[PDB]
Ligand binder design. Sequence first.
Ligand SMILES: *[C@@H]1O[C@H](CO)[C@@H](O[C@@H]2O[C@H](CO)[C@@H](O[C@@H]3O[C@H](CO)[C@@H](O)[C@H](O)[C@@H]3O)[C@H](O)[C@H]2NC(C)=O)[C@H](O)[C@H]1NC(C)=O
Ligand SMILES: *[B-](O)(O)c1ccc(COc2ccc(/C=C3\SC(=O)N(Cc4ccc(F)cc4)C3=O)cc2)cc1
Ligand SMILES: [Ca+2]
Ligand SMILES: [Zn+2]
Ligand SMILES: [Zn+2]
Length: 758
Amino acid sequence: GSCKGRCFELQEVGPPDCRCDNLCKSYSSCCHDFDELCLKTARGWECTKDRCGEVRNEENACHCSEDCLSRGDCCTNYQVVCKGESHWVDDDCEEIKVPECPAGFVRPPLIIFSVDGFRASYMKKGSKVMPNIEKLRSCGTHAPYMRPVYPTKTFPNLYTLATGLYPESHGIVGNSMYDPVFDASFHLRGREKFNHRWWGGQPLWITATKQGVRAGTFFWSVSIPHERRILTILQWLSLPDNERPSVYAFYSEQPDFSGHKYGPFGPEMTNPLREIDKTVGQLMDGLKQLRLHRCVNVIFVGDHGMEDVTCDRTEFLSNYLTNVDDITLVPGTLGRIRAKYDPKTIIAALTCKKPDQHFKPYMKQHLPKRLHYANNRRIEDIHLLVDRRWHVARKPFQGDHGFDNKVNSMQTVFVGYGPTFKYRTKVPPFENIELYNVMCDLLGLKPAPNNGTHGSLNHLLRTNTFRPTMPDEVSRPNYPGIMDLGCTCDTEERHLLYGRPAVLYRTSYDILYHTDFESGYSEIFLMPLWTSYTISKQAEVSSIPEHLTNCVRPDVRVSPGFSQNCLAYKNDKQMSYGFLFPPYLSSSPEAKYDAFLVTNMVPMYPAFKRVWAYFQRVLVKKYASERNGVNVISGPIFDYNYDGLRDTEDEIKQYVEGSSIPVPTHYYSIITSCLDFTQPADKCDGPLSVSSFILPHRPDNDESCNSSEDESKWVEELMKMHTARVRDIEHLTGLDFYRKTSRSYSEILTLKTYLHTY
Ligand SMILES: *[C@@H]1O[C@H](CO)[C@@H](O[C@@H]2O[C@H](CO)[C@@H](O[C@@H]3O[C@H](CO)[C@@H](O)[C@H](O)[C@@H]3O)[C@H](O)[C@H]2NC(C)=O)[C@H](O)[C@H]1NC(C)=O
Ligand SMILES: *[B-](O)(O)c1ccc(COc2ccc(/C=C3\SC(=O)N(Cc4ccc(F)cc4)C3=O)cc2)cc1
Ligand SMILES: [Ca+2]
Ligand SMILES: [Zn+2]
Ligand SMILES: [Zn+2]
């Protein structure tokens, strides 16, 4: 029942025997002698010139005796003060090609240095403010910024880094949450958070343990100081080969605490940032002292940013809502409403009431698809998006975080230093869901199913272990020739520049050729899955004639039993039709007749037509003149169950009144051109440029408060909000793009993960 020769033990003991680990403090199960044996304060954490050459006393924190090197308990500045050597930061920058680890090391260890609320723009401060951080940034691999996950809070973000999944999948959807099945509530302060029922998926420490790789403790008790944490890691690295782990983690509550109080632009922010660098300095000098400085791989990462938020700028529900006393709300930078009733009337009372209104109400299903925040029992149906610098409350500090993940102030940091990372290079910004696959590859582990694209971060490391491959095509297409119904009317490698998309599921479809476009018509869903066309900068927009307004002509390649009809839309009081290829952008008046075919017809509400027509008539040509030619691929999306994955025929819930024509939930479009704007889209030499969208198929424009005004005032702003990656479209459609290219497959995977933020 003592902690003698058991301090910070990797194995968990009891019950009922008292524990001597770095987690016992939170569970309140440590021995009485734990505080005396394991935690030592005496004579500080710094070795002085007058302390050099001393006799070992078993009461002091860190030792300054000659016999400390053989043990592994010297102070961080022992070799600098006593031996008379230089600090790691003062030494010149030298290349690390091969890991300089001692004999007996199977794999080079990884240390994760996570900092709370470190805004990406703090790095812009001088080298004299943060000298140890500026060396790691300039010598190793670094990115200007890193995108966090929504909500931009501590708990959903840190657990995302450890699993590689979205919060809707891992279970931790926020710092404060309620589960209807368990009938219990998860909070920041309480003993409920300690239960294993809330935490899902497979974290990094389990993945290592299951594959015969020893993993140290990730969670630290609040009472354990920053200096003692750095000392414990350096003590664990001196243990024998059969005892010492291969992965360690460090956590810091700052600069988040001093950021919430003073604000991101406050002059008081300089000093807490200086202490962070001092802790980094202690670790690097410690690694140099143990001669492990050219062996270990180190990561400096964050979780979210910081924005100027005050008491004066707050929106109250009592100024909008009917009762308010009968409801429950998760307040602050986001809003979630539930009962203690009709949700139809609650949204209606919150829609564009005040002119300068600083919040938008949503149903979890109608949120921008890029957020990935709906499919979970813990996520409330009524959701509220809050504007930057603002707060939301039920009824009646200089900083806060938790807003949209595309907000500039919410962006975080990333620095990769070690023998596996690239030397003196800079990489473009990436998303935090991609880290789990890199950490797994750095330790030589097989990752569990996660939401990352394996191979998209291969440009970061000098020596890659994983090589990505293309998925095989499941369904092969048909090439039909030639062979009522209420409808009346009075080179092909130029349109598909990057190869035809492959179908990854069991279906029956056929390819169709036209002078201005090319498509993949599905006989199961009676409409195409995609349509490809190219528009140059020289091209001009043509007007839609009067005699060809209600013109729909039958297709001779497709059977009448596997095609749409004009009678279905005539009988449907709420539905109308549109076209995937714009008739406005035709080569000749004869070629305009191809655009009005029944195989190019798609179901669209009259309210959505305002958005789709402005994009086709005005916006497409605008992009072609700026980007020097563009390549467009557009089609439909069905996602009723809101799981972000392609719906089966049994999962379709809406059809055109009296028929078997399905109604899409969303409409996608991919715009590709050459990265070198001096070159045209059809004559590209090197890399490409991309921008995509996932527009919702809504029967009203209530999302746009200025929808009463002309299209040139509200349309483009809506498209920017509903921006998406190529990978997002791929999950909702089951298609695989960019097949035939003169580029590397790794370059394609990076392009498929790009998000245009504007
Ligand atoms: C992001 O990644 C997660 C994990 O890889 C994806 O979730 C997994 O997908 C399926 C369907 O949602 C889940 O259930 C499975 O269903 C079949 C039905 O035939 C059944 O045999 C099993 O019950 C099977 O497990 C699976 O449990 C689930 N895992 C987790 C942890 O959620 C998710 O769909 C991805 N999101 C994207 C790509 O947007
Ligand atoms: B934030 O909103 O600014 C915020 C909210 C609450 C708090 C409360 O204080 C703590 C203190 C410690 C921790 C530690 C955690 S949470 C977690 O998942 N892990 C495990 C881990 C995952 C990934 C990783 F890289 C390292 C560790 C912890 O150790 C949370 C909140 C503070 C800030
Ligand atoms: Ca689905
Ligand atoms: Zn945080
Ligand atoms: Zn915080």
